Design a protein around this ligand. Structure first.
Ligand SMILES: C[C@H](CCC(=O)NCCC[N+](C)(C)C[C@H](O)CS(=O)(=O)O)[C@H]1CC[C@H]2[C@@H]3[C@H](O)C[C@@H]4C[C@H](O)CC[C@]4(C)[C@H]3C[C@H](O)[C@]12C
Ligand SMILES: [Zn+2]
Ligand SMILES: [Zn+2]
Lengths: 196, 227, 50, 700, 146, 153, 110
DNA sequence: CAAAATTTTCGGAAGGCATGCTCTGTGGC
DNA sequence: TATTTTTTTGCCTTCCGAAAATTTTG
RNA sequence: GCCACAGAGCA
């Protein structure tokens, strides 16, 4: 029952706007070792619709099938992952510095799943070229239809992808968290009284 | 038995619930002979005789490889050979296969080739799924067969199904003493007078099981009016 | 043919209750036991079986 | 218990919940009326009341029930609504706007007989021993019978062995919309069918129209790590390849190309498919954004249940199980009727408003409330006839029920008492044995084991037990947040591959997420229930075969109180009983101290109940309060029924309602169409506890 | 009844271990049900036969059974001695709950008292589970009559 | 590296052994360096040991993250009361006992800690900055496991 | 065949192509797996249950005979157990079962 | 001999049908 | 006007494309 | 009075 060691737990970064991606296709462990992280080329994010789009260039030397891509898919060489950021409450991304656990709130979690926009583009181009050869007050949309329409109308924001910036984030989180020290107010029973 | 049995007898019901064919064996005092005769009438699926079924793709050829068990055949004493399974696979009309595709590799291997934008894979998967449900031995309509040892000690092979003619034509079964509770089956096999006797016997058995004591002349009148 | 022993127990319980002066209970899975009512009937000069 | 929760007071509790709470929900469902002629015009309902003006300090005067019985009137209270509407150039709100008259049930909170002493009952010419629970419509006293239905917002899996097909059906029921969805098996393949969709949709396509876009994720959700389930389900993955549907937009095109729904606004085919997925496939699950995870997971687990049923037919759901059935009381049925009545009233009012505003001379908004009255009676009659005729025909929900209300039988006191707590079965044409007509063991202590009529209705109509409670709807969002704080993983941040490697959590049949430790979660939830932090009617139960923990919050569930047993000892001691007999420590405070708790059938499944204190082994979890609860009010008249045969008990449950005797204390002030009275009634010598509890000895 | 219960428990634990030999036409579950039903019918008949030979002359149910005017030996054996096994649809009491008949019995219990054996006579009064099982059988009879 | 481009074969377990293999699979999905109540206690002790080991192995290593699932309403702290989003600085501690169990003390309340669901998919932490001049999305590391902190009752 | 594409985790289908050689192609994304010189096979191991030897135990305490086993190239055993059985009609000869005492390989003659 | 007309087979949908008599009461045009 | 549930089960024949099988032309 | 609806009686 006596404690032999305690590790401090701090919270910082109320304005970081931290997001967490979840690649539904990329496995975490291959064999027994962690898998290599994919290389991200382009990133797009609609702000008010929270639509994340990540482009990953796939290898063309091995297992590419140049003919089909150059014929009907306009020579696509990048696989795109689309996801929607869901507001999840109570999630904190944590790191450890001098055996002290620092937490940063996670704003949204995105479920990135494969997207095939070239297939849709080919289909709509075929429909247009087959319809133009021989053809033969209203904003009452609410709910999912309005969300889909405002997502389609929305212009994507091109983001500058970057890596190797963990040092500045760690420095600012530790700097913000280390100075302040909070002492408790509520009793143990009072927490069980409301929303245990 | 009871009211549902009377109902399904007094009308010409093509399909009845739990039909029983009671075959009388030629060798009625041997368990081995009785079970060998059961192996001739009880249906044996390809799943019961095959170790594995697999789909094999090569550089330009695709085929289903099936490897069967001769040990289980010898242990259950089915009079069955490799060409029997080959012709049974060929006879499966729903599989859409022909004898030109089936080939014999080794003593245990049967190869079913598939020849031709994506119909080959769909046909290949459909054939693999439908193959281990084909009947290589036994009658197609017999659900199961049981050897029953009566009070006298003699053994009778009683089966669930609709193949009276095939049971009474099977070797080891006396065809002059094989009966069925189904009456239209008896009418199709033996004639109209046998159907009349089947009606009378089945109605009398149903009445006598409950002990209602109905005079048999009324039953004879009903059987004559039906036929 | 109908096996209504509860009617018999009701008759005995009613007899013992009237003679003793108290309404009896025939509650399911319980109620007034038969031995007590037989004892009341014996003490009142009647037969134990009613 | 019978002092507070009672055996008649299910009708009273349902009516009180409907009037006090459910009417506001029906109003908020259809609050806004907007004119197509003029965009600026709107009329909104912001509050609804029955028989009580906001300005008035007390309830308005109502005629006594005996006067309504004698004069062939209707015992009713006016419906007041608060209406805020645009007039001219400004918004004006009006309180106490009468739009109809709700026929109130006797001895409810809106009645004159509520908590009234015997002297007041003598003044009002009403018997103090009358059970209440009926409506006086046109002088005739009518009772809304309780209805058995299959459980709403739950997946029911059934199989036809002779036909070879299986199907999982869900009956989505919400105040906004109601629908039914099937996931059926045909030719070894899995399809999704709905009334709006013209043709059956393959399950891979409908899963692709949701958030899932990969076949491996579909297979991992439906099957998981089981090879047999993958072998069964691998056929349906090829249908996405055969029909060349590979994106969410293509799947939405395919779904919306064959939807028969007709709407006021013209909709794009892709938009129509989105609408069909969002609000038509599963009605009780709605989406307000681009995320479809909950809908996809619901359909995936429906398909998983279908696959499990196809692997072995013993994993189907028993349709006759009491836990799979819900009880519709008077309140729910009147709510469902008033929804249709208010929708018709709103449509007619909007049509009249649009008719007037087409005239350009009426620049003023003409005080549109002045036109309510011509339609207001269309509610009132629409209520009264639906209770008078007893026919419940609602074309909005495709409902054609007949025989909901029955004339209150006054052949005996026990006849009137026992016609309340009758339950009307769903299937009234089932002539088969061991179906709805069989006495399931699941109704032990929930429904009467002897009270059923002999004849064409044997086993269909049935009666409640003595000590039972029927749950009313509770809020699910606090329970959802409690699930999230107790350690349940969210559905939007978990792996599809490892979903079936750990127990899932189901809040009202909807997969809320996954839990790592199910038993600790169940124990903590039970501790919170017994302490009082959540409602006592929330049911927690873990199913190991499905690998799930289920939390039920909605109403319609039959419940029964039981004494908790911990460490092989009953939690009710002698001190608690002597305090109860002294006068303090009532049943609610037994609930608060956690000595007794309510168990429904599903929670009774994961329980071990001891009938007597001498039979307690330390594996017991609950103790029976008293066994003769398993017999109802009528069956409680039988003395020593465990010494008899069951058919005799059934026959006397039938014939106790035909006994000639005293009816009520005001039987000589009543004028009924047929009344048999006994000159010299006597109470029996061989009584029963049920006789004393229902006051049958007062009117023998 | 104790001898029959002990033998039934021996077959139950034999089936649970897995070395219960099967009947020629039945699997393990079916042969276990058939054997348990046979032993329960045998103990019913034996207790009834002991009961009937013990009743004295001028016994009204015995006289009415001897005449054939009303009743039979089985009804007298039910009133005075063990009521016996309750048969529903040709089998014992089905599992209304998950893997058991009632919550008052342990899970996966196949003991005679947990599947529809009414040990008590109609004179001695039925226990609540025996009451429920007898009610199930009677309801089935009335439904068939209807 | 091309072995990752081989066709993906799903994991398949027979129906008879689907419940027994889960103990092996839960351990195999992570990197290798009443009956139900007892089983859950043993699993909780194993999870506590794994959480302590994982916390020790990620000390000062860059690009390393681990997701806490805390209660959505943390205990109130008086202002220097405070909102659930406004907590800053030290809020509690993670305490290890001699038996190996771990307890998270926040304010004055003690909470249990578990390893949560096992995830086979890849997770990475992204810092987002939406600016008119230059909008940058930055990668900070990947998530190595999850832990859940639950109030004890 | 149940294989999924590594790029998008979608179902892989075998295509004949223009060259006439099968390839594991993905119809969603540009991915192909050639199989020239590589044999791809998916095996469905059917469940095998225990079967009682219907002829087993019938060769104990029976007369022997001097009949050569059919596998003469592998062994030259002559003494073999034999017995009679009627599994046919009564008007056709009773069939004869033989078991070699050295190599097994039980056979029925006629 | 293989195209092509012809005959037979095989499923799925569509109607038809389901104890007897007897007695009240209520509701709506 | 156009959101929107079922409320028995089993058996039976007739019709009618569709498909398989067989005959018949060229 | 017509029409359905609802309950009830006897095996
Ligand atoms: C339902 C069943 C198939 C199941 C799949 C088919 C296949 C075999 C069919 C029977 C045989 O043909 C013999 C006989 C011919 C008479 O003409 C009519 C009656 C008989 C008894 C048939 C009835 C029925 O038609 C059967 C059982
Ligand atoms: Zn791919
Ligand atoms: Zn040899």
């Amino acid at each position: 029952d006596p404690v032999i060691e305690e590790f401090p737990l701090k919270i910082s970064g109320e304005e970081e706007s931290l997001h967490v991606f979840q690649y539904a296709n990329r496995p975490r462990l291959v064999g027994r070792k962690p898998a290599e992280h994919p290389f991200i080329s382009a990133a797009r994010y609609k702000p008010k619709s929270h639509l994340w789009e990540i482009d990953i260039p796939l290898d063309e030397q091995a297992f590419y099938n140049k003919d089909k891509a150059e014929s009907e898919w306009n020579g696509v060489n990048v696989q795109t992952l689309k996801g929607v950021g869901v507001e999840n409450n109570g999630q904190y991304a944590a790191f450890v510095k001098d055996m002290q656990v620092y937490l940063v709130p996670i704003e949204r979690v995105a479920q990135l799943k494969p997207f095939f926009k070239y297939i849709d583009d080919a289909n709509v181009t075929r429909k247009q070229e087959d319809a133009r050869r021989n053809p033969n007050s209203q904003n009452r949309l609410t709910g999912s239809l309005l969300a889909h329409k405002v997502a389609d109308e929305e212009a994507n924001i091109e983001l500058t992808w970057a890596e190797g910036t963990f040092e500045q984030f760690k420095d600012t989180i530790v700097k913000e968290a280390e100075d302040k020290t909070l002492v408790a107010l509520e009793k143990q029973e009072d927490y069980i009284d409301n929303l245990v | 038995l009871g009211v549902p049995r009377i109902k399904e007898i007094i009308n010409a019901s093509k399909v009845i619930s739990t039909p029983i064919i009671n075959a009388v064996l030629v060798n009625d005092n041997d368990e081995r002979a009785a079970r060998v005769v059961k192996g001739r009438v009880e249906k044996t699926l390809l799943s019961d005789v095959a170790f594995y079924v697999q789909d094999v793709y090569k550089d330009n050829l695709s085929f289903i490889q099936v490897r069967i068990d001769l040990g289980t055949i010898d242990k259950l004493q089915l009079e069955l050979t490799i060409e029997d399974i080959a012709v049974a696979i060929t006879r499966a009309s729903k599989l859409k296969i022909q004898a030109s595709d089936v080939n014999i590799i080794g003593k245990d291997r049967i190869a079913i080739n598939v020849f031709p934008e994506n119909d080959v894979f769909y046909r290949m998967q459909q054939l693999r799924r439908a193959l281990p449900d084909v009947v290589v031995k036994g009658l197609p309509d017999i659900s199961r067969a049981v050897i029953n040892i009566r009070d006298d000690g003699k053994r009778e092979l009683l089966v669930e199904g609709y193949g009276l003619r095939d049971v009474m034509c099977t070797d080891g079964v006396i065809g002059s003493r094989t009966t069925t509770n189904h009456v239209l089956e008896v009418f199709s096999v033996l004639g109209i007078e046998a159907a009349r006797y089947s009606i009378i016997r089945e109605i009398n058995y149903t009445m006598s099981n409950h002990g209602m004591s109905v005079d048999p002349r009324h039953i004879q009148l009903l059987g004559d009016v039906m036929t | 043919s109908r096996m209504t022993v509860g009617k018999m127990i009701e008759l005995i319980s009613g007899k013992a209750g009237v003679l003793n002066g108290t309404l009896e209970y025939g509650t399911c899975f319980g109620g007034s036991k038969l031995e007590d009512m037989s004892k009341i009937l014996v003490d009142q000069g009647f037969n134990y079986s009613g | 218990f019978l002092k507070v929760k009672g055996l008649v007071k299910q009708h009273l509790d349902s009516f009180n919940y409907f009037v006090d709470t459910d009417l506001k929900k029906i109003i908020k469902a259809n609050q806004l009326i907007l004119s197509d002629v003029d965009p600026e015009f709107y009329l909104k309902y912001v509050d609804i009341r029955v028989g009580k003006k906001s300005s008035s300090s007390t309830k308005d005067y109502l005629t006594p029930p005996h006067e309504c019985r004698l004069r062939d009137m209707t015992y009713s209270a006016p419906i007041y609504v608060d209406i805020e509407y645009t007039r001219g150039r400004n918004i004006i709100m009006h309180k106490d706007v009468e739009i109809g008259r709700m026929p109130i049930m006797l001895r409810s909170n809106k009645c004159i007989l509520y908590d009234a002493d015997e002297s007041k009952m003598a003044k009002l010419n009403e018997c103090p021993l009358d059970p209440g629970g009926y409506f006086i419509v046109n002088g005739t006293e009518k009772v809304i019978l309780v209805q058995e239905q299959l459980s709403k917002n739950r997946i029911i899996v059934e199989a036809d062995e002779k036909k070879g097909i299986v199907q999982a059906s869900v009956t989505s029921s919400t105040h906004e919309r109601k629908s039914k969805t099937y996931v059926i098996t045909k030719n070894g393949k899995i399809y999704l069918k709905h009334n709006s969709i013209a043709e059956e949709i393959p399950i891979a396509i409908v899963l692709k129209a949701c958030g899932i876009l990969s076949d491996l994720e579909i297979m991992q959700l439906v099957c998981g790590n089981d090879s047999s389930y993958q072998d069964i389900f691998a056929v349906n993955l090829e249908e996405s390849s055969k029909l060349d549907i590979y994106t969410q937009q293509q799947a939405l095109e395919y779904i919306g190309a064959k939807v028969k729904t007709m709407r006021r606004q013209k909709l794009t085919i892709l938009q129509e498919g989105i609408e069909a997925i969002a609000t038509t496939v599963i009605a009780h699950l709605t989406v307000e954004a681009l995320d479809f995870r909950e809908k996809a997971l619901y359909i995936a687990m429906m398909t998983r249940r279908v696959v499990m049923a196809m692997y072995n037919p013993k994993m189907i759901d028993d349709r006759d199980y009491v836990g799979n059935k819900r009880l519709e009381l008077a309140g729910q049925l009147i709510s469902l009727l008033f929804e249709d009545l208010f929708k018709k009233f709103n449509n007619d009012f909007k049509l009249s408003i649009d008719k007037v505003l087409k005239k350009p001379n009426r620049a003023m908004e003409y005080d549109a409330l002045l036109s309510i009255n011509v339609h207001s009676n269309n509610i009132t009659s629409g209520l009264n006839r639906a209770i008078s005729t007893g026919n419940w025909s609602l074309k909005r929900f495709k409902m054609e029920r007949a025989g909901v209300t029955h004339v209150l039988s006054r052949l005996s006191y026990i006849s009137a008492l026992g016609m309340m707590t009758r339950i009307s079965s769903q299937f009234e044409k089932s002539r088969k044995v061991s179906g709805p007509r069989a006495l399931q063991p699941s109704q032990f202590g929930m429904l009467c084991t002897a009270d059923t009529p002999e004849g064409e209705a044997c086993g269909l109509v049935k009666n409640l037990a003595l000590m039972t409670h029927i749950t009313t709807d509770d809020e699910e969002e606090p329970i959802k947040k409690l699930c999230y704080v107790l350690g349940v993983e969210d559905i939007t941040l978990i792996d599809s591959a490892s979903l079936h490697l750990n127990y899932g959590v189901y809040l009202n049949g909807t997969l809320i997420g996954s839990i790592r430790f199910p038993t600790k979660f169940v124990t903590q939830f039970r501790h919170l229930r017994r302490t009082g932090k959540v409602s006592e009617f929330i049911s927690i139960y873990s199913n190991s075969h499905q690998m799930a923990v289920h939390i039920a919050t909605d109403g319609g569930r039959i419940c029964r109180p039981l004494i908790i047993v911990s460490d092989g000892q009953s939690r009710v001691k002698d001190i608690h009983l002597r305090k109860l007999l002294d006068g303090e420590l009532d049943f609610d405070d037994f609930l608060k101290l956690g000595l007794v708790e309510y168990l429904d059938v599903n929670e009774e499944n994961d329980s071990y109940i001891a009938l007597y204190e001498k039979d307690i082994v330390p594996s017991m979890t609950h103790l029976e309060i008293e066994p003769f609860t398993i017999l109802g009010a009528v069956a409680g008249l039988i003395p020593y029924p465990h010494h008899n045969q069951s058919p005799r008990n059934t026959y006397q449950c039938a014939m106790g309602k035909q006994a000639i005797g005293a009816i009520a204390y005001n039987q000589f002030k009543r004028i009924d169409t047929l009344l048999y009275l006994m000159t010299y009634p006597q109470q029996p010598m061989v009584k029963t506890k049920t006789i004393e509890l229902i006051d049958y000895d007062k009117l023998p | 009844v104790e001898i029959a219960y002990h033998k039934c428990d021996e077959l139950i634990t034999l089936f649970n271990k897995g070395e219960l030999e099967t009947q020629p036409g039945c699997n393990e579950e079916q042969t276990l049900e058939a054997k348990i039903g046979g032993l329960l019918s045998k103990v019913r008949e034996e207790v009834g036969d002991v009961c009937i030979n013990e009743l004295d002359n001028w016994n009204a149910p015995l006289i009415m059974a001897t005449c054939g005017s009303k009743g039979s030996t089985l009804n007298v054996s039910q009133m005075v001695a063990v009521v016996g096994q309750q048969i529903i649809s040709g089998n014992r009491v089905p599992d209304g709950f998950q893997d058991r008949s009632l919550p008052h019995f342990p899970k996966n219990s196949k003991t005679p008292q947990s599947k529809g054996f009414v040990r008590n006579s109609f004179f001695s009064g039925l226990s609540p589970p025996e009451f429920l099982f007898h009610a199930i059988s009677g309801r089935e009879g009335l439904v068939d009559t209807a | 590296r091309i072995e990752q481009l081989f066709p993906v074969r799903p994991v398949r377990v027979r129906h008879e052994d689907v419940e027994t293999v889960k103990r092996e699979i839960q351990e195999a999905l992570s990197e290798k360096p009443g009956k139900e109540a007892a089983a859950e206690l043993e699993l909780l002790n194993a999870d506590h040991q794994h959480i302590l080991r994982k916390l020790k192995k990620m000390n000062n290593k860059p690009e390393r993250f681990m997701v806490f699932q805390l209660p959505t309403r943390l205990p109130a702290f008086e202002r220097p009361a405070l909102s659930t989003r406004e907590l800053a600085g030290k809020v509690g501690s993670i305490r290890v006992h001699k038996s190996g169990k771990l307890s998270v003390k926040i304010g004055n309340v003690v909470m249990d800690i578990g390893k949560g669901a096992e995830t086979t998919f890849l997770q990475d932490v992204i810092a987002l900055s939406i600016a008119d001049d230059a909008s940058s999305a930055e990668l900070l590391g990947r998530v190595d496991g999850k832990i859940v902190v639950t109030p004890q009752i | 065949m149940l294989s999924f594409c590594p790029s998008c985790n979608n179902m892989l289908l075998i295509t004949s192509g223009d060259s006439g050689v099968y390839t594991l192609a993905c119809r969603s994304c540009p991915y192909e797996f050639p199989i020239e010189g590589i044999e791809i096979y998916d095996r469905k191991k059917l469940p095998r249950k225990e079967v009682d030897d219907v002829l087993g135990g019938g060769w104990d305490n029976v007369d022997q005979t001097k009949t050569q086993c059919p596998n003469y190239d592998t062994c030259g055993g002559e003494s073999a157990y034999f017995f009679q059985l009627q599994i046919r009609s009564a008007d056709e000869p009773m069939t004869t079962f033989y078991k070699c005492v050295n190599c097994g390989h039980r056979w029925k003659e006629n």
